[PDB]
RNA sequence: CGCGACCUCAGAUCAGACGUGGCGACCCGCUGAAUUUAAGCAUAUUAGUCAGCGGAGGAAAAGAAACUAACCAGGAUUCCCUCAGUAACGGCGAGUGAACAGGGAAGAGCCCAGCGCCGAAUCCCCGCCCCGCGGCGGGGCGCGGGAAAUGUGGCGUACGG
RNA sequence: CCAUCUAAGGCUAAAUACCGGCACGAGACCGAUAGUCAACAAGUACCGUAAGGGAAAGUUGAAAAGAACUUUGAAGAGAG
RNA sequence: GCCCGGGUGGAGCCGCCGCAGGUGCAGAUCUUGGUGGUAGUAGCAAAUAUUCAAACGAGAACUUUGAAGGCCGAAGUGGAGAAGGGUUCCAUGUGAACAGCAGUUGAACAUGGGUCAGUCGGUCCUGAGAGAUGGGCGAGCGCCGUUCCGAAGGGACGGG
RNA sequence: CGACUCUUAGCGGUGGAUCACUCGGCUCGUGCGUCGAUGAAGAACGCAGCUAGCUGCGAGAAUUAAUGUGAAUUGCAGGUUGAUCAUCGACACUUCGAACGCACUUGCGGCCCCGGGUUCCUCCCGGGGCUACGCCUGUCUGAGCGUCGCU
C-alpha cells in the first residue's frame, strides 16, 4: 500500500519507469474522480500518489547522477553539474598545491635558518 | 476647465508594468523604468531615500538561495558526502 | 554674548561632530580580548619568553630626555658582528635585529 | 544619547577610606543590629572561625 | 544559580521558546512523574507521556483515585485527554476536558522497545551519577 | 585640463566656486589611462604603465596587464600575489604606481595630511570625539 | 478593453482568483485571529492600479 | 609570377578559462554644494561635509625611510594617552589647527629590474602508463606542439654582492 | 662646511574600524497615542501617471464549558 | 495632598534611608481620539407624468404581468464599436450592511457558470522617430552619433 | 400640581481612559564575518481533500531522499519494516531578471541529434543539445606595392 524508497534502489530503470507510468495514470484517474465527485477516501489518496511519484522520480535521478559521476570520476574535464559546487569565490581560489609550493630561494633560506626552540633563565 | 472638465480626457496611460522590478513604472515612450531603470544594466538606487532603499533591499524577497547558503556555511560548505546509514 | 566677566572660549563644535563620536563602551571587552590573545600566544610558544626577543639599550634622542635610557627597536649589525652573532641566526635564536641603526659612540 | 556620562571615578584614597569605615563599623553590635541583622545569639560579632 | 553564558534566563525569550517549540520538544516538555512503585522499580523519576498510558489525576476539579487511560495527546494545546475526565455540553454531547501532564502521574507504562530503551538509559545515567557522587 | 561640467556657466553659489575652465584634475593622465585599460579588460589585472609618446592633443601610454588565471603565473610562487582577490582593480582603487602619486602618500614632514591610511583616515582620526567611559 | 495582452490577462486572472472570502473552517481553528478577509476589492471602489 | 619565412592585423557556435550584477555598517579612489556662523556680506566657515560616480575584503588602506632630529642621538606601518586647543593659518575678524619627542597595544621582515656567471640550465599544453583524485596534483615515457634570446630559470638587491 | 637618506619598481600578518548579514548574551530603557512606521495577514491596506507617500489595529474565560430546550416575532431582536 | 468607611474589581503593591530621571498642564488657530448645542434644522426642487387591476409576499407609491395616458423622435433616452474598466456579463438564492425614502429589486452580498477562428485582429512592413555595434568623447555610471575616422557578404546558378 | 430647565445621587447607555499583563521594540556587548553566468539580489505566476491572507515550496510545487528522534498532525474528514518533528551532506529547483539566438508581442529564427509521417525522400509534428558581449592562452583558416630569401 505504501511505496518506499528503500526497496526501489536495486531495481533498474525500465520497471522504475513502468511503475512511474502506473502511478501517473492512477493520479489522473484520482483527479477526474475528484472532479466528478468521489469519496473522501479517494480524495485523500491524491497526496499519497503525488508523493509516491516524487519518490520514484527522486530515486531515478539519484541513481542516474551517481552512475554519471562514477563514470566521469576518471576524466580530466567534468560537466558543471558534477563539478564541486561551493561559493563562487572559493571556487576560484588557489588550490592546495599552488598555495603550498614555495620558491627555492625561500626553501634555501628556511633550510639554512630554521626557527629554534629555546628558553632563557630568569 | 483646467480641473474637473479636464480630468475626463485622460484615457491613455504613460507607464506599464516593468519586466524586471514588477512595478507599474515602465515609461512606454521613453521605454525606461522609473523605479529600477530596467534598460540600464545597474539597478537604480539613490541613498537620498533610505526608505526606498529599504523597501526593496536584500532581506525583502524569498532569498531562495542566500537562505540556503547561510545554513550551508555553518558546516564549512560540506559537500560530496552523506551521514552514515543505519 | 559675553557675560559680565569670563574667559573667551573657542569650542570646536561647529562641524557635524555628533555623527563622528567614539564611545568607549567596549573598553573592558577589548582588554579581555587582548588578554586572552596574549595568553594564547604565550601558550603557543611553549618555552620561549612571553614578551618576545630581547632588545637593546638606547638613549632618547632629545635634550628633554637624553638622560634616560629606553628599550630600542633591535640590535644593529656592528654590535652583532663584534659580538660574533650572525644577522640571520640572531632573529631565529631570539635577538631583535635592525639594520637602520648606526653607532656613533 | 548613548554618550551620557554613565560612569564615575572616585579617588583611590577615598575608596580605601570607605572600605576602612565599613570594616570598622561592622564590628559594633549596635550598628549591625540597626542594619537589621539578627545577631542576638552570636557569641562575638567579629566572628572568626578557623581555616578548616 | 545559572552560570552558563550561552543559556538565557530572559523571561520573554524563555516564554517564546516554550510557546513555539517544535513537536519533538513538546514531547520532552509534556512529561509527567511516575508513581512510587514504578519509580522504585525502574529507578526513574519522570517519563514523557504516551498515547495509552493510564493516569491518576492529582490536582484540579477531577483529582481522585480513578485510573484513567489516556485517549490522545494534543501537543498543540499542551494537553492530554483521559477517557474518564470529561463534561457534557449544552446539547448533551460529552467532550473531554484538557489536563496538563505536569498535574498527572502514570500508573503503569506502555512497554514498547523504545520505551524500555529510554527507561534503561535514564536509569543507567542516574546510577552512574549517583556512583560518581559517592 | 578639466573644465567643470556645468550647463553654460551657472555654477550656482558663492563666487569662490565660480571657476569653470581653469581647474585641474586630481589624478594624472597616466592614472586615467590605466583605469580605462582596466575597465575595458575586466578579466585582467593592471600591473604598471609607461609613457611612449605625446603630441599637442594626445598622450600615449602602454600598460601591462596580467591574466590572473593563467597557470604560468598561478604556479609561480613570487607572482601569485596578484591572483588574490584583494588585488582587484588596483588602478580603480589607486594602488598602482601612477595612481599612488596622486594620493599624497609619503613619510616625513611633507606628508602629514595622510598619517594613517590616507586623507580620509587622517581626517576621521582628527575629527572625532574620544568620549571615554570615565572622562 | 477586449484587446488585451497575455500578461495583462494573467494578472487579471490572479487578481480575480484572490477575491474570494475565507473558508468557514478557518475562524474556529485554535491559534486564529482572523475574522474575515480584509483584502477584498470591489471594481467600483478601488481601480486595481494598472 | 610562384614558393617559404618573419612582422603587423583579421575571422570564427574553434579547445579550455576569466569579467559583468547585488549588498554596501566598516574601507579605498574621484567629484563635491548650499542651508548655517560671521548679529549685514563677497574672502573665510559650514566642508573636502551632504548628495553623485567607481572598486573591494573579512577587514580595507598603510608599511619596512630619497624618515625624525641636531641630541651622549633615535629607527617599517597601524592604534590609544599626551604633546595641545599648542607651533601655525585667519576681512589676523568670526573661526580653523597639526607634527616631533615621551609612555603604551602589537611587533616580521622581504623580493625584482639592472650589473654579471651558468650549453634556456625556464615555462605552458596535448597522447600513453602508474597513485589517490568532492580545493585536477605527483612520477615515467613520447625524433609530440608551442612560448621564449625583442631574454625564462638558479646565484644575487644597498643590511653590500 | 656639516648631518641624514637613496626617489621616480613590487609583496607583507598583529595591534585598528564595523548603525549591513548569521548566531547569541544582557539592560537602573519603553510598556500599545510609549518603544522601530510596523507586538496584529506592515512597508500591509490605501493615495499618486510616476519619483514616492503610508496607516489604524493587543487582552472572553482556568478550561468553549461559546448559552441545549420552550415561547413571541418574517427577522434582527427578546423573555424563560 | 493624604488617611479611613462603603461599592466594583480580580493579582500584584506600598512605608522609611539613599540613588536616578523622558517626573506634575488650562491654554500653544497645541497632537491624537471621543462627544455636544446647532438640530430632528438646512435640505432629499435642472431636463412635462403618471393612473387602474391582479400575483407573489409578514410587509408594495417604487417589484412582475395586463390595460391606459405620456416622453425620447433616427444629429435618439435606439442598435453596435475604439480607449478605459476587469467579471461589472448569465442563472439561482438572501435581504445583515450599501443603492442619502423604500424595496419582494440591483452594476449590492452569496453560490455556481460563461469568451472556441488558416479566412476577424495582433503577429509582418515602414512613417515621424527610437536605438546597438565600428568610431569619438568621457574621472565615471555612461554619453554622442545611425553611415558617419569600419577587412560590415557566412549567400548562390553553375563547374571541378 | 403638569410640561420645560437646573443641581446632586442611584441605575442604564455612549466612549474607551486608567491599572495590570507583553512570543514586540530600543540600546550595549560577544563570536563569526559567507552572494553571482555551476545563473545572485529582486520580481511574476503557480502548488494544499476542503485554502482567501500570512508562511512554506517549484510541475518531484505547505515538499522527495538521507540522518537523528520515537507515536503523532489536528479545524473536519481519510489512512514500530517507523507517524510526526528536527537536522540537512543526496537529488530537484517554472518565467523574467547581469539574463545570454534575435526582440519583448511571448512574436520570429538557424544548426546538430532522436521519436511520430516517412519506412530518409524530402516536408510537417513532438523531444533533446547548442546559437550574447568583452577578454586571455593555444589551434585552424586567412590578408598586406610591410621586411625579406630561392626561382
Ligand atoms: Mg550601483
Ligand atoms: Mg544676560
Ligand atoms: Mg559668569
Ligand atoms: Mg550545564
Ligand atoms: Mg579634489
Ligand atoms: Mg611628482
Ligand atoms: Mg470610477
Ligand atoms: Mg542673524
Ligand atoms: Mg542674508
Ligand atoms: Mg565661502
Ligand atoms: Mg574647504
Ligand atoms: Mg556620500
Ligand atoms: Mg561590482
Ligand atoms: Mg565577500
Ligand atoms: Mg592590504
Ligand atoms: Mg630599503
Ligand atoms: Mg614614527
Ligand atoms: Mg595644557
Ligand atoms: Mg579686523
Ligand atoms: Mg578645514
Ligand atoms: Mg611619537
Ligand atoms: Mg610591549
Ligand atoms: Mg636575469
Ligand atoms: Mg629604491
Ligand atoms: Mg618602496
Ligand atoms: Mg601594498
Ligand atoms: Mg553580564
Ligand atoms: Mg491602554
Ligand atoms: Mg480592551
Ligand atoms: Mg488574570
Ligand atoms: Mg524612564
Ligand atoms: Mg488638556
Ligand atoms: Mg424641514
Ligand atoms: Mg447606444
Ligand atoms: Mg447593447
Ligand atoms: Mg445583471
Ligand atoms: Mg435607503
Ligand atoms: Mg470553419
Ligand atoms: Mg544612443
Ligand atoms: Mg444621571
Ligand atoms: Mg493557493
Ligand atoms: Mg522524508
Ligand atoms: Mg524518519
Ligand atoms: Mg510589436
Ligand atoms: Zn523596473
UniProtKB/Swiss-Prot annotation, chain A:
Among Pfam families, the record links this protein to: Ribosomal_L29
Stretches of Basic residues bias are at 85-95
Q: Does the keyword Hydrolase apply?
A: no
Which BP terms in the Gene Ontology apply to this protein? maturation of LSU-rRNA from tricistronic rRNA transcript (SSU-rRNA, 5.8S rRNA, LSU-rRNA); translation
Q: Which residues carry this modification: Phosphoserine?
A: 28
PROSITE patterns given in the database record: RIBOSOMAL_L29
Superkingdom of the source species: Eukaryota
What are the GO MF terms of this UniProt record? mRNA binding; structural constituent of ribosome
Q: Which InterPro entries match?
A: Ribosomal_uL29 (IPR001854), Ribosomal_uL29_CS (IPR018254), Ribosomal_uL29_euk (IPR045059), Ribosomal_uL29_sf (IPR036049)
SS bond list: none
- HAMAP family per record: Ribosomal_uL29 (MF_00374)
Cross-referenced PANTHER family: 60S RIBOSOMAL PROTEIN L35, LARGE RIBOSOMAL SUBUNIT PROTEIN UL29-RELATED
Q: Which family does the record claim for this protein?
A: Belongs to the universal ribosomal protein uL29 family.
Protein's UniProt name: Large ribosomal subunit protein uL29
Swiss-Prot record, chain B:
Zinc finger extent (C4-type): 18-36
Protein localization: Cytoplasm
Q: Source organism's superkingdom?
A: Eukaryota
Residues bearing N6-acetyllysine are 9
Q: Which residues bind Zn(2+)?
A: 18, 21, 33, 36
Which keywords accompany this UniProt record?
Acetylation, Cytoplasm, Metal-binding, Phosphoprotein, Ribonucleoprotein, Ribosomal protein, RNA-binding, rRNA-binding, Zinc, Zinc-finger
Q: Which PROSITE patterns match?
A: RIBOSOMAL_L37E
By its UniProt entry, which InterPro entries does this protein fall under?
Answer: Ribosomal_eL37, Ribosomal_eL37/eL43, Ribosomal_eL37_CS, Ribosomal_zn-bd
Which GO BP terms sit in this record? positive regulation of signal transduction by p53 class mediator; translation
Which cellular component appears as one GO term in the record? cytosolic large ribosomal subunit
Q: Which GO terms describe its molecular function?
A: MDM2/MDM4 family protein binding; rRNA binding; structural constituent of ribosome; ubiquitin ligase inhibitor activity; zinc ion binding
Per the entry, what this protein does is: Component of the large ribosomal subunit. The ribosome is a large ribonucleoprotein complex responsible for the synthesis of proteins in the cell.
Q: Which family does it belong to?
A: Belongs to the eukaryotic ribosomal protein eL37 family.
The record's note on quaternary structure and interaction partners says: Component of the large ribosomal subunit.
Protein's name according to its UniProt entry: Large ribosomal subunit protein eL37
Q: Which organism is it from?
A: Oryctolagus cuniculus
Q: Which gene encodes it?
A: RPL37
Curated annotation (Swiss-Prot), chain E:
* Sequence segments annotated as region (Disordered): 1-21
Name this protein carries in UniProt: Large ribosomal subunit protein uL24
- Summarize the protein's role: Component of the large ribosomal subunit. The ribosome is a large ribonucleoprotein complex responsible for the synthesis of proteins in the cell.
Taxonomic classification? Eukaryota, Metazoa, Chordata, Craniata, Vertebrata
Q: Name one GO biological process term.
A: translation
GO cellular component assignments: cytoplasm; large ribosomal subunit
Outline the subunit composition.
Answer: Component of the large ribosomal subunit. Interacts with DHX33.
Q: What is the organism of origin for this protein?
A: Oryctolagus cuniculus (Rabbit)
Which Pfam family would be a valid example here? KOW
Q: Output the InterPro entries linked to this UniProt entry.
A: KOW (IPR005824), Rib_uL2_dom2 (IPR014722), Ribosomal_uL24_CS (IPR005825), Ribosomal_uL24_euk/arc (IPR005756), Ribosomal_uL24_KOW (IPR041988), Translation_prot_SH3-like_sf (IPR008991)
From Swiss-Prot, chain F:
Q: Which GO terms describe its molecular function?
A: RNA binding; structural constituent of ribosome
User: Where is the secretion signal located?
Assistant: none
Residues with the modification Phosphoserine, per the entry, are 28, 31
Q: What's the protein called, per UniProt?
A: Large ribosomal subunit protein eL15
Q: Name one GO cellular component term.
A: cytosolic large ribosomal subunit
Crosslink (Glycyl lysine isopeptide (Lys-Gly) (interchain with G-Cter in SUMO2)) position: 14
Role according to the record: Component of the large ribosomal subunit. The ribosome is a large ribonucleoprotein complex responsible for the synthesis of proteins in the cell.
Which keywords appear in this protein's UniProt record, sorted alphabetically? Cytoplasm, Isopeptide bond, Lipoprotein, Myristate, Phosphoprotein, Ribonucleoprotein, Ribosomal protein, Ubl conjugation
Q: Quaternary state and partners of this protein?
A: Component of the large ribosomal subunit. Interacts with IFIT1 (via TPR repeats 1-4).
Q: Where is this region: Disordered?
A: 96-117
Return the similarity comment.
Belongs to the eukaryotic ribosomal protein eL15 family.
Basic residues bias: start-end ranges: 100-113
Q: Name one GO biological process term.
A: cytoplasmic translation
Q: Subcellular location, in the record's words?
A: Cytoplasm
Amino acid at each position: 500500500a505504501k511505496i518506499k524508497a528503500r526497496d526501489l534502489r536495486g531495481k533498474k530503470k525500465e520497471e522504475l519507469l513502468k511503475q512511474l507510468d502506473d502511478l501517473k495514470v492512477e493520479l489522473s484517474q484520482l483527479r477526474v474522480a475528484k472532479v466528478t465527485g468521489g469519496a473522501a477516501s479517494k480524495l485523500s489518496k491524491i497526496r499519497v500518489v503525488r508523493k509516491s511519484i516524487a519518490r520514484v522520480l527522486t530515486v531515478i535521478n539519484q541513481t542516474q547522477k551517481e552512475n554519471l559521476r562514477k563514470f566521469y570520476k576518471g576524466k580530466k574535464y567534468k560537466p558543471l553539474d558534477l563539478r564541486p559546487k561551493k561559493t563562487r569565490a572559493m571556487r576560484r581560489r588557489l588550490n592546495k598545491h599552488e598555495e603550498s609550493l614555495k620558491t627555492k630561494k625561500q626553501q634555501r633560506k628556511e633550510r639554512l635558518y630554521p626557527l629554534r626552540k629555546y628558553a632563557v633563565k630568569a | 476647465t483646467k480641473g474637473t472638465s479636464s480630468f475626463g480626457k485622460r484615457r491613455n496611460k504613460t507607464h506599464t508594468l516593468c519586466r524586471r522590478c514588477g512595478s507599474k513604472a515602465y515609461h512606454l515612450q521613453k521605454s525606461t523604468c522609473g523605479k529600477c531603470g530596467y534598460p540600464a544594466k545597474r539597478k537604480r538606487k539613490y541613498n537620498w531615500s533610505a526608505k526606498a532603499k529599504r523597501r526593496n533591499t536584500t532581506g525583502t524577497g524569498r532569498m531562495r538561495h542566500l537562505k540556503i547558503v547561510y545554513r550551508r556555511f555553518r558546516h564549512g560548505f560540506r559537500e560530496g558526502t552523506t551521514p552514515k546509514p543505519k | 554674548a559675553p557675560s559680565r566677566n569670563g574667559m573667551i572660549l573657542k569650542p570646536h563644535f561647529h562641524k557635524d561632530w555628533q555623527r563622528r563620536v567614539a564611545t568607549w563602551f567596549n573598553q573592558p571587552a577589548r582588554k579581555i580580548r587582548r588578554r586572552k590573545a596574549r595568553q594564547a600566544r604565550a601558550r603557543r610558544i611553549a618555552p620561549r619568553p612571553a614578551a618576545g626577543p630581547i632588545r637593546p639599550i638606547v638613549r632618547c634622542p632629545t635634550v628633554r630626555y637624553h638622560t634616560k635610557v629606553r628599550a630600542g627597536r633591535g640590535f644593529s649589525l656592528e654590535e652583532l658582528r663584534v659580538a660574533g652573532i650572525h644577522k640571520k641566526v640572531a632573529r631565529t635564536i631570539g635577538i631583535s635585529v635592525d639594520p637602520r641603526r648606526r653607532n656613533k659612540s | 544619547k548613548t554618550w551620557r556620562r554613565w560612569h564615575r571615578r572616585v579617588n583611590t584614597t577615598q575608596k580605601r577610606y570607605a572600605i576602612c569605615s565599613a570594616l570598622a563599623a561592622s564590628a559594633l553590635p549596635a550598628l549591625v543590629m540597626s542594619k537589621g541583622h539578627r545577631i542576638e545569639e552570636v557569641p562575638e560579632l567579629p566572628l572568626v572561625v578557623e581555616d578548616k | 544559580m545559572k552560570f552558563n553564558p550561552f543559556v538565557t534566563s530572559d523571561r520573554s525569550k524563555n516564554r517564546k521558546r516554550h510557546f513555539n517549540a517544535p513537536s519533538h520538544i513538546r514531547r520532552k516538555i509534556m512529561s509527567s512523574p511516575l508513581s512510587k512503585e514504578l519509580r522504585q522499580k525502574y529507578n526513574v523519576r519522570s517519563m514523557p507521556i504516551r498515547k495509552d498510558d493510564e493516569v491518576q489525576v492529582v490536582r484540579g476539579h477531577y483529582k481522585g483515585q480513578q485510573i484513567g487511560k489516556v485517549v490522545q495527546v494534543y501537543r498543540k494545546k499542551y494537553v492530554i485527554y483521559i477517557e474518564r475526565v470529561q463534561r457534557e455540553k449544552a446539547n448533551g454531547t460529552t467532550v473531554h476536558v484538557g489536563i496538563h501532564p505536569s498535574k498527572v502521574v502514570i500508573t503503569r507504562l506502555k512497554l514498547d522497545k523504545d520505551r524500555k530503551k529510554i527507561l534503561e538509559r535514564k536509569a543507567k545515567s542516574r546510577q552512574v551519577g549517583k556512583e560518581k557522587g559517592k | 585640463g578639466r573644465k567643470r561640467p556645468v550647463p553654460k556657466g551657472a555654477t550656482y553659489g558663492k563666487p569662490v566656486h565660480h571657476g569653470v575652465n581653469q581647474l585641474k584634475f586630481a589624478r594624472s593622465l597616466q592614472s586615467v589611462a590605466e583605469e580605462r585599460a582596466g575597465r575595458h579588460c575586466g578579466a585582467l589585472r593592471v600591473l604598471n604603465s609607461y609613457w611612449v609618446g605625446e603630441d599637442s592633443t594626445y598622450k600615449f601610454f602602454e600598460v601591462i596587464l596580467i591574466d590572473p588565471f593563467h597557470k604560468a603565473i598561478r604556479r609561480n610562487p613570487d607572482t601569485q600575489w596578484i591572483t588574490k582577490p584583494v588585488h582587484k582593480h588596483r588602478e580603480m582603487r589607486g594602488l598602482t604606481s601612477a595612481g599612488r602619486k596622486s594620493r599624497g602618500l609619503g613619510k616625513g614632514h611633507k606628508f602629514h595630511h595622510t598619517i594613517g591610511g590616507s586623507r580620509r583616515a587622517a581626517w576621521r582620526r582628527r575629527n572625532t570625539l574620544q568620549l571615554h567611559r570615565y572622562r | 478593453s477586449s484587446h488585451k495582452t497575455f500578461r495583462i490577462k494573467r494578472f487579471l486572472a490572479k487578481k480575480q482568483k484572490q477575491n474570494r472570502p475565507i473558508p468557514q473552517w478557518i475562524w474556529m481553528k485554535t491559534g486564529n485571529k482572523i475574522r474575515y478577509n480584509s483584502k477584498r476589492r470591489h471594481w467600483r471602489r478601488t481601480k486595481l492600479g494598472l
